[PDB]
Amino acid sequence: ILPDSVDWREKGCVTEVKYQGSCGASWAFSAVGALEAQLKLKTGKLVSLSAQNLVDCSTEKYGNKGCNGGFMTTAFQYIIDNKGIDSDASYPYKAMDQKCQYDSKYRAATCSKYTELPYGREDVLKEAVANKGPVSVGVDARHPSFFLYRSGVYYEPSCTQNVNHGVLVVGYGDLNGKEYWLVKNSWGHNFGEEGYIRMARNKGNHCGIASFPSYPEIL
Numbered sequence: 007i008l009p010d011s012v013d014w015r016e017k018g019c020v021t022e023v024k025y026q027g028s029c030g031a032s033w034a035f036s037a038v039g040a041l042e043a044q045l046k047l048k049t050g051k052l053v054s055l056s057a058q059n060l061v062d063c064s065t066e067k068y069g070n071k072g073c074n075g076g077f078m079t080t081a082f083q084y085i086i087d088n089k090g091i092d093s094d095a096s097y098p099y100k101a102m103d104q105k106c107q108y109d110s111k112y113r114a115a116t117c118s119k120y121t122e123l124p125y126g127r128e129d130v131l132k133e134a135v136a137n138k139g140p141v142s143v144g145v146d147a148r149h150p151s152f153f154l155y156r157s158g159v160y161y162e163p164s165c166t167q168n169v170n171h172g173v174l175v176v177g178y179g180d181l182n183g184k185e186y187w188l189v190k191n192s193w194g195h196n197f198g199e200e201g202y203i204r205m206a207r208n209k210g211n212h213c214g215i216a217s218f219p220s221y222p223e224i225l
């Protein structure tokens with residue numbers, strides 16, 4: 007029923023890796039990442055969506071704090087409420103808290119709903135990644151082994167299920183018997199494998215990868 011491997015990058019549904027710099031907007035990058043894939047799936051056009059738009063506009067009414075962190079779910083709720091999000095090109099990433107400058111004239115995507123997946127359920131995440139597209143997730147990235155990761159399947163014995171960094175699952179597979187989640191980060195191309203990390207899959211919700219997954223959909 008489900009494929010052994012998926013890689014949404016090969017379906018033209020994933021934009022280039024971005025670089026959040028010293029602004030804690032991983033939540034914003036994870037959210038736009040997931041919506042970018044739905045925009046391509048539904049319109050055939052792959053366009054980077056404005057993470058800055060989320061940082062400036064999906065703020066304290068959404069429980070978010072811009073460069074001091076936030077949630078992908080309430081980012082999606084902002085896009086829903088706002089009836090749009092601007093393209094990255096029109097509303098570029100400055101890695102700073104700014105005044106909201108959303109302009110409907112440069113709306114590149116919309117969002118009608120989002121779905122949150124049950125805590126810890128990697129089978130359900132697998133299904134969603136296969137059948138719906140890239141899923142926005144949280145991970146515990148506060149380990150040197152994570153930010154120093156280069157290649158292979160990341161496993162960290164002291165990883166917890168308490169998430170603190172937003173990323174985007176763009177697929178899954180296995181590498182010589184070790185199953186993994188294919189994860190797009192927002193630490194630029196010099197993080198990991200050209201900006202991606204393969205994280206242990208079906209090993210007890212490792213690094214809380216399936217603790218808080220969510221994905222948007224477009225009407």
Ligand SMILES: COc1ccccc1C1CCN(C[C@H](O)Cn2nc(-c3ccc(C(F)(F)F)c(SCCN4CCCCC4)c3)c3c2CCNC3)CC1
Pocket residue numbers: 032033036066067068069070071074075076077078079080143144145169170171172173218
């Ligand atoms: C104040 O709330 C308001 C107010 C108004 C409207 C809506 C809300 C929302 C109500 C509640 N929801 C989500 C729920 O709490 C579920 N959930 N989600 C997460 C969750 C997911 C992804 C990420 C990630 F790493 F990917 F970014 C994260 S990193 C922490 C994000 N922090 C840090 C700084 C302060 C603000 C942002 C956490 C957690 C939980 C529960 C347990 N702890 C972790 C968020 C806010």
